[PDB]
Write a protein that binds this ligand. Structure first.
Ligand SMILES: [Fe+3]
Lengths: 324, 163, 324, 163
């Protein structure tokens, strides 16, 4: 939990960071990651915007499941309590050149470091969670902070938003410019006498219409291990995902396009287009990335059953959910 | 010139199924279906299973007329995806405390009336454990129900998904 | 060469375009190409910003030499007189899946099409030749044009800029903000008595100091087929170039990083970092792309001999230039 | 809190040669050298080939004191990458019509003075066809000569490039 960071660069303004072997520094346009392989120091450059957007999802999701790739070179892999940070290890050509490198870390330390890297590289002009059209540039020299955007406080949802001891509804937030025509009507709830506040319903669409973040599933209903985690998508999913378990999507408004390839070298497997009302299962043996022109309403359905990885490794569960 | 925002929702009368483009492999591997194509081709309140995930299901109901009284031992949920749906609630004097899945509550459930909720499209409501709930639709609609596989859950994979 | 267009989109405002069997369209975020391969129509999306900068160069360059790649799927190969537009053909994995397509066009058709596309998709707020910090967003719905930017004019250098019949010097151009600190002092030209206007000289650092474009080799000295084409570089070179002959580079200021790879495998062949003074050759068997944090001065040294490509093609000439 | 615009140029007394990190292949294929390095380790006005492309060459000369007399059958340019070089021109009455590459015009060429040019860092001039030019450098500096391979063109790849 003790973050090796440097002093602010003389010209640039930004701190550089150390994480095991990995060196992470940035300048006016690029983040730059450094690792050792074959006796020399290898480098890689990613546009600041791409980089921050991805790191933000990495932090927000707690490193998620499976493989989270910032791009064809850099990515992380959550082994729950421990996280791998890797460079090219899952890029065919680098693995084969012997130039790649991985290193494990305890979750609490890599988190402290990533959270730190964001606090320092996100200027007051940029919001890593937003679509491009919604926000300024990530480029240039260091210029203030944006704590408000990279440090969102949320109340965990226990059962459903809108209940008393639960997460709040969003009536106090603006409707997003791209959801400006979604009805803001709430369901009518007529409780019988002696039962006031014993029944609950809200407007999911009104809810998502007011989402200030992008590509961030958030929980709206819990059924034991079954979680509904709707999100609102705009532009390009900030990372490409190598799956670990089967995932399910229900497209609720508009459309998203999904690129789908082998988890390794990226042999195209499919290209999926989901229009309103479509239900799709993403296999556990592929990687995927989403494109969405208009801010759209997508429902991500998660299974929080803990022994899930055991099941997939045993063959108790096949790569794809259904034999028909 | 055009500044008009148009958020696209589907309905039973007007839906366009998406497309799976295969490059290597099989479309069946993605269990790809549309909820609106499903409700358009199902009996009133047939709980069709569209997501199956380690026993947890997402079911699509076609809302038309009045449903059976339903119950379960655990919470379930409904999103009204199209239509207008009135949900009626009853606090059972003797709720099932065990088991899993949505079950038929009986013809004449025993308990005190808790009241009703009026759901239009986009609205979600809680179907609390140990209550019995009933659906009434004056206009054909689509209900998404989140729950666990049980007796009333119907699987027609070949019939609903690309192959 | 009669361009195949469509009426502007009822919402988007932009127009689509046919070209053989490639449909090319755009919306508020993405360009999209559509082609046939495998008995189905395949698609690919490129963020509108990436795509425009790339086409801008391909068009400005008369389709250049050899392979010009907009990104990992899309590009053009110039056969001087005819051009190939391809999807995936040059990407090894895409080819191996048989998802790729190439079509061959008469140079003036494709050119008239790309010119039309540039005209119609570049909003009045977007400068395709400019670096990100210097211009606005490619995104949104159609918003006016920007001919003052995609429709520039250069007098072809015949021998040297500053000569009475030749391309002009740039005294009527602001200095670029990242070059603010470069000397505007000209040379001293003391033409002997009875010889005024017979000696020719200028500041090449002032000339580039005033480059209004980015990543655009323009000629500043001819010597038979030997051309000197400096240019000012900033951010990421909009295409990744496939060589059909030997390019040579001489960095004159700051630095540039070059990701050099197999002309098909993408083989990390090398990662070359050039500082001020560095000179280096680009084999004809590799593809290259450059990374320049600060706006920089590069010299590209061309050879315009008309048969060169047959030589490397046939094998008569080795891909690297010198044996030692 | 910093608007510092520093465009970096290199000198003879201060240069930072770049780097070629190979993944697969050989650094030799890149003919990678530095022109300030090559100048610091060469005789005054030794025409060192740092670029070669089918006969056409780029040359680097170390600027020091007076040059011989040079002349050729075609145009040729020079850039001053460092210091100050003064360039004196004479119009040959009887110049070479054939051949290529830069040639010595001798100790005492026969022609009418054209005057001179006074180049500084980053200036470029034309060494016209059928004229003979001469260099004179007060302090050490560097010259870049665009031309063709002649009998004065020196090739020492082995020494300048990486491997
Ligand atoms: Fe995923």
């Amino acid at each position: 939990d003790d973050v090796q960071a440097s002093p602010p660069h003389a010209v640039t303004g930004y701190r550089s960071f150390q994480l095991g072997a990995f060196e992470l520094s940035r300048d006016e346009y690029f983040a730059r990651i450094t690792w050792p392989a074959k006796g020399e120091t290898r480098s890689h450059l990613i546009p600041a915007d791409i980089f921050l957007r991805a790191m933000m999802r990495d932090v927000a999701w707690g490193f998620f499941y499976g493989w989270v790739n910032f791009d064809h070179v850099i990515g992380t892999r959550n082994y729950y309590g421990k996280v791998d940070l890797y460079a090219g290890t899952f890029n065919g050509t680098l693995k084969a050149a012997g130039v790649n490198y991985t290193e494990n870390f305890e979750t609490p330390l890599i988190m402290a470091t990533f959270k730190a890297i964001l606090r320092d590289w996100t200027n007051a002009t940029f919001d890593p969670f937003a679509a491009p059209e919604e926000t300024g540039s990530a480029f240039g020299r260091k210029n203030g902070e944006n704590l408000e955007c990279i440090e969102r406080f949320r109340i965990a949802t226990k059962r459903m938003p809108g209940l008393q001891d639960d997460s709040p509804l969003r009536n106090d937030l603006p409707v997003n410019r791209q959801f400006a025509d979604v009805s803001q009507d709430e369901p009518e709830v007529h409780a019988a006498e002696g039962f006031e506040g014993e029944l609950h319903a809200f407007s999911l669409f009104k809810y998502l219409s007011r989402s200030d973040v992008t590509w961030n599933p958030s929980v709206t209903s819990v059924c034991k291990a079954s979680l509904f985690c709707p999100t609102t998508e705009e532009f390009i999913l900030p990372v490409f995902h190598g799956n670990d378990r089967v995932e399910w999507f229900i497209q609720m408004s508009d459309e998203i396009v999904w690129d789908v390839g082998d988890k390794d070298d990226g042999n195209p497997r499919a290209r999926i287009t989901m229009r309103a009302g479509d239900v799709c299962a993403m296999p556990a043996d592929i990687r995927h990335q989403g494109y969405s022109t208009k801010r759209s309403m997508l429902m991500v359905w998660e299974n929080a059953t803990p022994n899930l990885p055991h099941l997939y490794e045993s063959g108790e569960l096949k790569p794809y959910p259904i034999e028909f | 010139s055009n500044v008009a925002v148009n958020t696209v929702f589907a309905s039973l009368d007007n839906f366009r199924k998406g497309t799976v483009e295969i490059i290597s492999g099989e479309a069946r591997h993605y269990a790809f279906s549309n909820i609106f194509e499903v409700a358009q081709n199902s009996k009133p309140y047939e709980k069709v299973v569209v997501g199956l995930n380690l026993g947890y299901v997402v079911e699509t109901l076609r809302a038309e007329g009045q449903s059976p009284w339903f119950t379960a031992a655990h919470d379930e949920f409904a999103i009204v995806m199209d239509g207008e749906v009135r949900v009626e609630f009853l606090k059972l004097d003797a709720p099932s405390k065990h088991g899993e899945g949505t079950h038929l509550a009986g013809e004449l459930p025993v308990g005190k009336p808790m009241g009703y909720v009026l759901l239009k499209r986009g609205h979600q409501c809680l179907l609390p454990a140990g209550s019995a709930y009933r659906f009434e639709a004056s206009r054909p609609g689509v209900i998404l129900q989140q729950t666990i596989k049980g007796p009333l859950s119907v699987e027609k994979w070949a019939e609903i998904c690309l192959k």
